[PDB]
Amino acid sequence: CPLMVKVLDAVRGSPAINVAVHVFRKAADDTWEPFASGKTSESGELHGLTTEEEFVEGIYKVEIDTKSYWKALGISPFHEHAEVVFTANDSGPRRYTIAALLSPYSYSTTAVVTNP
Amino acid sequence: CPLMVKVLDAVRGSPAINVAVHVFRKAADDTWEPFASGKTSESGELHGLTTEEEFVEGIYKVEIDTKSYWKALGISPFHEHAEVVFTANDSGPRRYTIAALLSPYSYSTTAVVTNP
Amino acid sequence: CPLMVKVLDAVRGSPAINVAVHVFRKAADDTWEPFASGKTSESGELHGLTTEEEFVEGIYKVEIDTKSYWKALGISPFHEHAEVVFTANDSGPRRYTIAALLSPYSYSTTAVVTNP
Amino acid sequence: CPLMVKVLDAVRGSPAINVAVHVFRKAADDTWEPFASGKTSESGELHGLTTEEEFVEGIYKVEIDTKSYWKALGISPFHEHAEVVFTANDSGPRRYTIAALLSPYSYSTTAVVTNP
Ligand SMILES: Cc1cc(C)cc(-c2ccc([C@@H](C)C(=O)O)cc2F)c1
Numbered sequence: 429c430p431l432m433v434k435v436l437d438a439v440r441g442s443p444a445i446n447v448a449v450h451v452f453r454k455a456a457d458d459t460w461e462p463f464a465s466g467k468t469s470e471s472g473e474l475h476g477l478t479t480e481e482e483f484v485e486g487i488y489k490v491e492i493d494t495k496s497y498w499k500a501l502g503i504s505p506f507h508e509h510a511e512v513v514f515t516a517n518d519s520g521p522r523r524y525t526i527a528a529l530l531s532p533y534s535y536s537t538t539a540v541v542t543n544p
Numbered sequence: 545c546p547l548m549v550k551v552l553d554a555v556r557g558s559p560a561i562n563v564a565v566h567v568f569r570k571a572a573d574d575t576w577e578p579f580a581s582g583k584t585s586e587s588g589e590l591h592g593l594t595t596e597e598e599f600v601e602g603i604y605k606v607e608i609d610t611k612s613y614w615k616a617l618g619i620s621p622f623h624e625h626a627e628v629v630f631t632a633n634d635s636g637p638r639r640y641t642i643a644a645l646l647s648p649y650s651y652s653t654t655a656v657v658t659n660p
Numbered sequence: 661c662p663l664m665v666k667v668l669d670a671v672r673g674s675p676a677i678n679v680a681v682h683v684f685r686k687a688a689d690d691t692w693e694p695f696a697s698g699k700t701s702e703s704g705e706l707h708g709l710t711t712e713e714e715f716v717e718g719i720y721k722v723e724i725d726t727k728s729y730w731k732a733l734g735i736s737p738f739h740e741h742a743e744v745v746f747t748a749n750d751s752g753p754r755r756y757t758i759a760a761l762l763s764p765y766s767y768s769t770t771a772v773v774t775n776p
Numbered sequence: 777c778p779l780m781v782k783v784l785d786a787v788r789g790s791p792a793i794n795v796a797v798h799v800f801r802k803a804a805d806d807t808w809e810p811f812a813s814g815k816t817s818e819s820g821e822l823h824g825l826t827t828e829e830e831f832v833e834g835i836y837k838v839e840i841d842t843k844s845y846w847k848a849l850g851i852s853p854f855h856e857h858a859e860v861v862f863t864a865n866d867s868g869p870r871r872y873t874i875a876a877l878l879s880p881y882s883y884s885t886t887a888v889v890t891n892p
């Protein structure tokens with residue numbers, strides 16, 4: 429599991445459950461090619477997006493569908509979605525966790541990049 | 545000044561100076577049209593991006609060029625840029641401040657929306 | 661104005677108004693002595709806490725009364741308060757801005773330290 | 777495991793490993809009584825702090841010894857320590873995770889409160 433996404437809710441103090449997450453890889457012509465997607469679990473995590481063989485160096489975009497998340501909870505949100513855009517680099521560690529902390533008018537994100 | 549950007553550096557405990565910012569607006573064909581750009585001052589603030597007349601209703605993307613910022617300080621950061629994507633002015637004209645807090649492997653952003 | 665506090669609300673996308681702040685300084689006996697207090701204005705800012713003369717070197721604790729803030733808006737938050745504890749002026753006088761971003765179950769804080 | 781602490785490093789993009797964490801419970805006379813302590817693991821987590829029988833309702837303080845963390849990595853930090861102060865309430869969920877994201881001049885914290 430070289431790529432994991434973990435989403436938390438700063439209003440409810442809970443995992444962000446059943447959030448849609450789409451990953452894209454930047455193509456040669458600078459367009460965004462669908463790569464992987466899924467919905468966060470009851471723990472706010474999304475595992476199994478890709479495999480070591482599929483996850484090559486390059487620029488990736490993780491889109492988190494925050495607007496749908498907030499409106500399913502009855503909350504008015506600011507953003508259309510959250511975006512995390514980063515380069516995967518085979519130098520240094522090989523497991524990427526993209527973590528996001530959501531509020532209606534704000535979000536935080538960090539990267540946790542490690543070896544097993 | 546209906547759109548402003550303010551950026552802080554969480555490593556230095558200082559304004560983030562000379563941060564490039566590019567604003568896009570979603571066009572009729574659903575592409576991202578360049579709208580405005582500038583860079584943060586010595587105070588970490590970017591004023592004068594647009595006008596009340598030109599800042600019409602739409603979906604806007606504020607790209608904050610965090611990689612360029614960190615590389616210019618000699619640091620190899622995680623992200624390519626921070627994105628803030630939102631619908632603006634859909635209940636009439638508002639003033640938006642996009643605030644960001646930067647670290648090499650993490651950033652936060654918030655919006656301050658006021659009615660003049 | 662060598663110590664200032666600025667607070668934003670990540671649910672409302674607005675300044676956090678009428679936030680009570682209490683500042684303490686560690687005394688010779690290692691207890692927390694009350695130093696100064698105030699509350700955020702309509703802009704989310706708190707000016708006039710102290711003076712250059714009175715703001716001597718020491719360990720300071722800035723308590724931001726987040727529970728009181730959220731309860732006054734009818735919300736039952738997680739935290740009692742946010743604390744920011746730091747040594748001030750140990751390389752000579754500096755100006756400190758303590759910035760905070762509030763959600764009901766989460767907060768962020770940063771320091772902006774400048775040399776006048 | 778009713779109380780867990782999880783610490784991440786926003787400069788290195790890693791867990792915050794071998795950080796000292798002290799938990800206190802507020803006594804009747806408003807002093808802070810030592811309650812539990814430990815050091816974060818290789819995953820930035822601290823498990824086994826307390827037991828259901830020991831963790832009663834009341835106000836708790838989680839101190840994270842960030843200053844020692846940063847100076848063991850050769851980094852100049854702002855804060856003396858990070859503080860998280862909250863009420864444990866048997867109404868609603870019974871597992872508390874206190875998560876913290878560290879930068880030299882900033883920190884974020886959230887609460888993830890759940891049932892199994
Ligand atoms: C204080 C803070 C800030 C940010 C951007 C993420 C998180 C966070 C998000 C998801 C998670 C996942 C990995 C978890 O809860 O196990 C952990 C976190 F510390 C916490």
Ligand SMILES: Cc1cc(C)cc(-c2ccc([C@@H](C)C(=O)O)cc2F)c1
Nearest residue numbers: 643652653654666759761768769770
């Ligand atoms: C994204 C983020 C994170 C944190 C901890 C503070 C702030 C913040 C708080 C107050 C202000 C005030 C001083 C302002 O200039 O609007 C600015 C900020 F960027 C923004």
